[PDB]
Amino acid sequence: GLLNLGVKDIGEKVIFDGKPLNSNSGYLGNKLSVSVEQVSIAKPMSNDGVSS
Amino acid sequence: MSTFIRGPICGTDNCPSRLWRIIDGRRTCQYGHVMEGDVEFNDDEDDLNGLGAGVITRRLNLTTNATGSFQSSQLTNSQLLQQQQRQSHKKFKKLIGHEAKLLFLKSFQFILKRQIRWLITEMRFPKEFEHVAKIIWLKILKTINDQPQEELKLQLHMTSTISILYLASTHLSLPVYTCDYIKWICTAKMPYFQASEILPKSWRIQLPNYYVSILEGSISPFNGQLYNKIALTCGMIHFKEFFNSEISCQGLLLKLVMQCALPPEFYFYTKQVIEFEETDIRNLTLWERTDERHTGRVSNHAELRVLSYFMLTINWMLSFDRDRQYPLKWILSLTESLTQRTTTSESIGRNIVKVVYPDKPTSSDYFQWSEEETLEFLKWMEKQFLPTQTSMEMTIDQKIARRKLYKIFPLDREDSTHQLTFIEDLQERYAKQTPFFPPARKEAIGRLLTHIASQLLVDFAISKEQLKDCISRIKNACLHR
Amino acid sequence: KMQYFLSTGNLVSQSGLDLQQVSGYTVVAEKINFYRFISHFRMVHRGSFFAQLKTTT
Amino acid sequence: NKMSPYELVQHKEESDEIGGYFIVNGIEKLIRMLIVQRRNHPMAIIRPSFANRGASYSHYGIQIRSVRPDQTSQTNVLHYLNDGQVTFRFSWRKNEYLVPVVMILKALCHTSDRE
RNA sequence: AUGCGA
DNA sequence: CAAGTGTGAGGAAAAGTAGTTGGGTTTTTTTTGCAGTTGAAGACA
């Protein structure tokens, strides 16, 4: 479906804890890959008095 | 009353009433005349693009245009609300102390009375049973008031109530203790085990301040537990002076012989040994008011000794029946026939008492539970466990859910009178032995005695040795011929 | 957020979704008449920005 | 979506409910359809805004509205500058950027000028 | 402001 | 050999309150038309 292709195209958003590790720093202080694999939509449901 | 004016009054005529003509835009005199204001403000046109973040917002501290001249209010401190909510969430109980004790007292008062009237219905023992029981506790109450001040050691206990009914019955001397206890458990005749009844709904809530909640059968009696409090009640009561012939009953002997190997002779045998050294030829009476808190081997629990003489008699009698009146093969036949068997109500009851799963003497019958015994058991659970009970709140939802669940498994039912009566069973086993006319017999005798030890002990606080401690005691008593 | 956008029709994002406007995308179904109801789903708009144009071409 | 008319009536609806709209806070709203440039196809346009971009801009230009499989679109413009220069228009973070088309050409694939 | 009666 | 005084702990339960987590408002602070005008780059005597 269209929405899952969209989330496959946004790909990743990468962030480095600022390289630290004390080349440790320069060569990033580890990569933190992030993304969204699937997107599901569910039919309307309502549970009252919450769980249970 | 309050006054009028907290805004305007008509300074013309002294008429302190005000009209609103919303069509006019006018505040006017309700009774008399004129313009109370020509000015009228805030009913905007068709132009409220709403750019205004209008951060202000009323909050009742800047007053209000007072657009109601109708008023009465009152002086306020500043948003009752917290005091309002405190008052809504006030009516509960938040008591404790002497006041809580009085109703703890009261509730105890009531359940005992409910206990007594089922007493009358079951036994049909006229004004008499009823009034003696009433003054008995009147007497019990007398003592409680005296050591009051702030003394909150009222004993009672789940046990105290039946001790009360027990002593009152003995005054009258209608029955027995073991029989009464088994009957009561089997038919839940007593309201004893659950304390929700009363008509407390409210007493329940009176945050019975620690007291009341402790009501409700809390648990089933151990070894002593129940003969001990009877003694305390007697000491409380000074019962022996007050009431005649306590602990007595030639009826417990009958109950006991029929209990099993009912021998048209062992009633008189044991009655005779009782005659013998059993309190010098005298119906043993209710032990005394064991005032002391240590409650030691009072042992003069009359019955406890009756059962002891009963047991003793059997083996003495049977293991020196020189004339050989009781055949070798006869003794095991009795113990034989004895093996389990249904019960026109009684044995089913004794199973129900066995199921207090105590010292594992009946635990296994737990396991075995002779087929139907299994069945008439589930029958008595679907009838007498229902009271069982009635989540309050926690969703008028889950209540619903629970109901649905019950509906789902609907349980129950998705010559007659099979369970013959008591004297029927009794008859048929004395017939089952009706063929009457060394190391092995000694063994058989011991075998049989262990069985009765099971039976008599099982109705009662046992002491898989006090029993015999008891046994030991009179053993010693006896040899002073 | 999507109830937000669907309740105002002010679709806003850091890309502008390649659309010339940030309002007007959503309309009340206005069931006052079955004709009106069916007509909304056969209505097509050239977009508000051309409503702003002064010409008529 | 899949209820037969009879069931639909059993669910308190107009036996024919077309749907396609949204109930948001109880008010039925549908998204108005919009007419946009045909995707994926170069459309030759003369526009005086193109002259409004600055010096050396002609009117002439190509506009293709590329839409991704997911249907998000990205419009790409070519401008013929009066000087013969060709510039490539695109939009990112709703900001405009201009690049020489010969740059995106040598950037896409290794090639010769004669290619 | 969006849709609409005149 | 044995019977009787002195006394501190072991045990049960409903209602309230603890720990851990989550939900949840509340809370707060990309040109599309016109006509005129100023400042500019460039130029002159």
Add this chain to the structure above:
DNA sequence: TGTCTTCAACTGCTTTCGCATGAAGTACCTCCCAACTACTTTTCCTCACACTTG
């Protein structure tokens, strides 16, 4: 030193009158509230070992 000429950036408006009267926005932040299960709190209840006697 003194005066002139062209172009590009900035200013103000281009239907009238009213209904549905206005509505709920929404980034960044969070302290308070409702929940499920387990743990803790207050009053009350009942029995035992030891030291000394016969």
